[PDB]
Design a protein around this ligand. Structure first.
Ligand code: COY
Lengths: 453, 252, 453, 453
């Protein structure tokens, strides 16, 4: 493989694949913090060209953390369909980009080709894509999964109802649920991040969620986003099982930071099959986002985009119902502003769909980042055009506990009515029964939580 | 006329022609979340959007503000800092926020007690308001809890520009069996006085992972009351000494 | 009137309507340069609240430039339907925002309501709208015009072919024309900004444009974007007339800077009626954009958003086929970065549709501004979802002569296929006949200018 | 439990669940041979009534072969969703029958309900269903899987091309392949039962099948129906992998008779993931059929219907692309005549769809059984109305090597055109491209294998 190019008479030398992958990234504060970013726009482009000229084989055989040192690398590499790999191993990343974007490449062609990819190759394609490349490429790669609702069907747009409270108060949780359902939010999941990671508390939160689900026969699923171990334990004790959640990272050390072993995720599948109230075949839920590996000291000299793609390689193995990047969840140290957050969200969603997972995005930012709510509204619409499977829904987008701003309930309704998108067909049916939705649009009585009383 | 920061503006119901209007008042009272604001088409109502933008401007100011050097000195605390120099650097360099500066290491060995059983550490972190509002309410009953019917207590000190992982260095230098860190969380939209507690048993720079810590979050008047939270942290500290474990390694 | 509010216990006092309008704007470079921007984020919100509580009458009666001193103000004020105005004069700007965004407000409701508005009122509503408000609001306000093509029908998306050249070389202009058509670009217009503002050169460029149109019987129209006086002369002396162009400004001083009298636009209307090869009833073409009035010393202490809205009030009188903002054509001095360009673009389009003009947008940036091509791709997609009537098209978006980057020919095809949008129905039929388009999609042989040979 | 009822004043006493299950069956030859059949028609009805009054719990807790002695029973029992089971455990088998047949019971309702079932419960419901119950019940339980084609979508009907030869001659296999494709057969699989169970011959037959697939770019999959161990070896040594086949039985003893361990089916799953040319997520293929357990001395005093249902509980664990009963493959000793073959076929298909597998049927008979080709045509049409996923296809249905008669290539075309059913959508598109199919119908040039030359 060639590790150098000439640009405007100047030679641009690179030491390894990991460096080329890093410097080909568009500028972000996290890559500068990791010391892996390009020195200039010229070096960035030269890195993109070197990357584009490298083969799938060059990148598959050079994962950022070695096979023997990382269980996630082993997981990713051993899931490869080697026949699919052999067909594409001599393709340049330039050729792979053009193949993904081609109108002569069908959904079924990509279904087989993606099986010969590794996460590093997925990231490599994303790095040589413009914003519209990432949007259009993702759109022609739909991923459909099924719990009690079907998510990912082109022409549809789902939403996680996120009814969070500072004290896990069941009245405050219910009120946000009723408000969310009134806007048609909740077809992805009704998922609460709990304050106390406690078995008795999880059961009470779940019973509140399922108290509403059972009362109105809602086709959906509940979830409590504690550590996977306490979810498993509570469900084993008889708490209602919908989706089982875990935050994942793209390295073994990153998973050890979260207190996760691969055996726990396998156990989550088995507990779900034995206990969970899910009609379909998918019941797992993961969240991701750029910067997490670097935060854990677990990026090993690799950029955050490549590490983020490794998440999707790991997630794919467990065939989850939904995955979303939580794009601006952490802070300005990994993604500084509007520009970087938008780019990351488009990258994350593109890579998720190329990896073949049910990919959504929590369009978000923090109050210490150079951003505002107009960023969320910009990104959610761009991502919805890319066929993003789901976003979050909170009252006005204000999380009273997690201390950040996501998308409003209003925003899902806006996106759906703007782009003529429907909810999950099962959930849509229920919304019509309740008189909340007619022909994809909120009725006059919608947006009013008192309708349920 | 209306002040967008007033109580009446926060309690405002914007739902036009409600199905059951007494339920909406009961829903607005049950939560701090921006519920029952109504809509204009699929878009938020103007007043709700205005109140959102007003609370954002206040939230933006609340993040780059600093605890005065005089306030910490008045609380009888040692002020020490990380490798970080100012607020702007703190927001972009978390790695420097995780390490005490050279003069900080020397000051801790000079002025703190050696090998304590429980070490209490306070830091501004990402919110100065979190430690300002809650301090007098949380810190005194924590000390009168750990000492009274308890064991060897370290001297409390303030870390300026600190991140959670800095307690690992604090635990090694002081030889602490349990390190308690009271730190400001990143500020929310309409609320910025939310404090967190991070506790770890016998930490090490090269072995301790984040899962080895126990987190007590959302400590404020709108969350877990600081006085009530103080007795939780004491009990946690006692359980951590008894089990010789913290975080995911603990029982139940 | 209230020119005061109290926010967090702090009283904010404003001098006049002009200051309230200016300070309510989202932060941008031009407003700071004009010295009319807010001092703080709290004062910005204060101005937003003060503006929202002001009535339509308050804003209508206080234009930024006086009636007696400004012919543009006169034209705006005299065009008002007073019956429409009287129905809405006691409405707050907050109530008008909610009225525009409401799903109970039909296209025909706004059709009458907008006739009681002035440009300052249009601007005021925009200032208290979030990014998604601007997008959704504009979407439910379609404006349909017809030349030889129909533009602005919901579910369609048009494009100006801009085949500019450094020497007005006819081979270079034609080459770009064949390239653009092969991507389905040119349903809005085939419009050339000429190098030399003289009759013979204009006649040569028009003959080149119309050489292509006549040979392939293309349902479209040509335009040479010289000064209106030179176009009129060329047309009277026998050059083929399609669209007649003029750059406009929001003040009499601004028009004098460009060297335009309102009588010339009246003359263009009459010349179009006598000479132009246009089947429909619309033949004028204006371009606008924030900063031009401030550049002319013709903003009179007013912000660039309000001044840009006055462009649309002026344009409306002449019922043009197409108007577009050239969002970031000038430089960072008026619009600094990605954020500000996206915001301005959404504002401009929303205000144009509210004013009842056939509003499109040249999604663009300059090389001395803090922006890149990914900005253009973000904005074009967002505006397309807002029902933007048209964007530009150039080979890869590189204007080799106006020295800026706009949208690629590729981008029009991308937007159409991403969002299931069609070209102008007349032009679409031509593309199908040429074998370039099938079911809204480019065929295999499309994207190849040699197809015409 | 009640193991007793009184009918016409006569008390009928039954020993156990196993006897109730056996005697409730409609009269068939195999059950008489097994000595488990009813003595009279009144006792048959008595057993039916006793079974109907028994609960789900009664049948689930009493499998025909014990948990501790049978790995198939273990696999069936351990796969149960206990939450689903607990909702339905107190339901009578009569109530479950009414639940399955009810129009108020949706596809998603059964999706969750079936997870609380075991194979014995599946069998029990079938035993108290009339022929039209079996047809209607199966129809409202579609099962959709995807390899390189999608099978089981309502309104579609697939077919296995079975080009068997006496000497595995490649000219004879290819000839039958071109014939089958010309009738639109082969969307399920192109599957050959080989003469010689060895690696080189399997590799030769697969190369022949895939020679056709690659030349005409056929969306389908190949299969050589040898023992699973030989297929795995061929595939690991470089032979093209499509579907991996294994004949299965409802007991550990039965699997030992066929020489299969459950680890081999796990291995096939893993080998498929690494090597197979399959775009979708399903690649296994099982065949089943009543009598095989009784042939092996592995029925353990149980009837052939219940044992056949246990095949589907076993198959379900491995989520195969396709399963089919080979209804009358063995002889009169297990299924004697037209009546018994039709009944068995309807039972098998209903039980497979209830078990959640992609259930098809080889509509067939042997020459020593009391049946003819009119039987095959009766059954194929009835099963097609039940939404049978697929049948076989051979030239006139004559297997020149397995010595039995199945359905003709003609029969697939007949069923499709009679019932307005389409092939697999991917394969249908291929047929349209080849000029073989138009609007679900064979063209004039179809039915002619020389079309490929
Ligand atoms: C930001 C944040 C994080 C992030 C860490 C910060 C970073 N990487 O720089 C993030 C995204 C990695 C994250 C992960 C998790 C994981 C794992 C944490 C671990 N063991 O490493 C987590 C276990 C989720 C899961 N189920 O797997 C988790 C949980 C449950 C919690 C809760 C703790 C419950 C409890 N009582 O124990 C929690 C209170 C929220 C809640 N659910 O109510 C919160 C502390 C919840 C917090 C809510 C709140 N109200 O405070 C919140 C919002 C802010 C904390 C803060 O402001 N700290 C002050 C700041 C100055 O400290 P700092 O030094 O800059 O940062 C440190 C701490 O924040 C600490 N830390 C953060 N979380 C956390 C949890 C525990 C138990 C401990 C001991 C220490 C923890 O890690 C860093 C070390 O540098 C937060 N987190 Co986390 C909330 C989870 C978010 C949803 C999924 N998610 C979002 N984005 C991404 C992503 N990119 N990838 C994958 N997943 C996600 N968090 N979290 N988190």
């Amino acid at each position: 493989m060639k590790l150098k190019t000439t640009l405007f008479g100047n030679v641009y030398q690179f030491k390894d694949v990991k460096e080329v992958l890093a410097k080909a990234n568009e500028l972000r504060s996290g890559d500068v913090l990791a010391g892996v970013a390009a020195a200039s726009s010229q070096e960035r482009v030269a890195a993109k060209q070197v990357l584009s000229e490298m083969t799938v084989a060059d990148i598959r055989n050079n994962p950022v953390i070695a096979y023997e040192d990382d269980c996630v690398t082993r997981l990713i590499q051993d899931d490869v369909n080697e026949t699919a790999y052999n067909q594409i191993k001599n393709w340049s990343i330039s050729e792979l980009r053009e193949y993904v974007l081609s109108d002569e490449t069908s959904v079924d062609d990509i279904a087989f080709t993606r099986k010969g990819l590794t996460s590093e190759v997925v990231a490599a394609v994303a790095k040589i894509c413009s914003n519209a490349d990432l949007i259009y490429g993702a759109k022609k790669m739909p991923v459909i999964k099924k719990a009690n609702t079907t998510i990912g069907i082109p022409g549809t747009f789902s939403a996680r109802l996120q009814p969070n409270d500072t004290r896990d108060d069941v009245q405050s949780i219910a009120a946000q649920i009723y408000e969310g359902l009134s806007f048609g939010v909740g077809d992805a999941v009704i998922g609460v991040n709990p304050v106390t990671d406690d078995v008795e508390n999880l059961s009470r939160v779940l019973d509140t969620i399922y108290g509403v689900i059972d009362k109105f026969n809602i086709p959906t699923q509940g979830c409590v986003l504690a550590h996977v171990t306490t979810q498993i334990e509570a469900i084993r004790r008889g708490a209602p099982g919908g989706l089982i959640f875990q935050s994942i990272c793209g390295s073994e050390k990153g998973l050890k930071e979260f207190g996760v072993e691969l055996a726990m995720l396998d156990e989550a599948r088995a507990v779900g099959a034995e206990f969970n109230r899910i009609a379909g075949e998918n019941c797992l839920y993961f969240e991701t986002g750029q910067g997490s590996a670097l935060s854990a000291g677990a990026n090993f000299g690799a950029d955050q985009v490549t590490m983020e793609a490794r998440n999707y390689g790991l997630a794919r193995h467990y065939d989850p119902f939904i995955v979303n990047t939580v794009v601006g969840f952490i802070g300005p140290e990994y993604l500084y502003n509007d520009r970087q957050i938008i780019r990351a969200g488009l990258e994350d969603h593109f890579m998720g769909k190329l990896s073949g997972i049910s990919m959504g995005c929590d369009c978000c930012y923090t109050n210490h980042a150079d951003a505002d709510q107009n960023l969320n509204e910009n990104l959610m619409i761009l991502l919805a055009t890319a066929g993003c499977n789901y976003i979050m829904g909170m009252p006005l987008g204000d999380d009273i506990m997690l201390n950040y701003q996501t998308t409003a309930f209003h925003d899902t309704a806006t996106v759906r009515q703007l782009l003529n998108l429907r909810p999950s067909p099962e959930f849509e049916r229920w919304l019509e029964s309740m008189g909340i939705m007619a022909n994809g649009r909120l009725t006059k009585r919608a947006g009013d939580p008192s309708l349920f009383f | 006329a209306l002040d967008l920061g007033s109580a009446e503006a926060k309690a405002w119901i914007g739902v036009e022609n409600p199905h059951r209007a007494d339920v909406l008042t009961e829903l607005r009272r049950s939560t701090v979340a921006r519920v029952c604001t109504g809509r204009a088409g699929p878009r938020p109502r103007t007043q709700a959007l205005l109140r959102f933008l007003a609370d954002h401007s206040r939230s933006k100011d609340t993040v780059l503000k600093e605890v005065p050097e005089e306030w910490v000195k008045a609380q009888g605390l040692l002020e020490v800092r990380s490798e970080i120099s100012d607020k702007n650097l703190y927001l972009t360099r978390p790695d420097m926020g995780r390490r005490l500066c050279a003069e900080a290491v020397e000051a801790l060995k000079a002025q703190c007690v050696a090998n304590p059983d429980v070490q209490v550490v306070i830091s501004d972190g990402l919110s100065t308001d979190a430690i300002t509002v809650n301090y007098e309410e949380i810190l005194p009953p924590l000390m009168a809890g750990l000492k009274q019917a308890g064991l060897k207590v370290g001297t409390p000190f303030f870390v300026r520009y600190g991140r959670v992982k800095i307690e690992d260095q604090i635990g090694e230098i002081l030889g602490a069996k349990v390190v308690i860190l009271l730190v400001g969380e990143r500020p929310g939209l309409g609320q910025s006085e939310s404090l967190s507690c991070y506790a770890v048993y016998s930490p090490r720079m090269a072995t301790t992972v984040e899962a080895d810590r126990t987190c007590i979050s959302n400590i404020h008047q709108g969350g877990t009351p600081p006085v009530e939270a103080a007795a939780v942290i004491v009990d946690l500290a006692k359980r951590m000494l008894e089990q010789k474990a913290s975080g995911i390694n603990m029982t139940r």
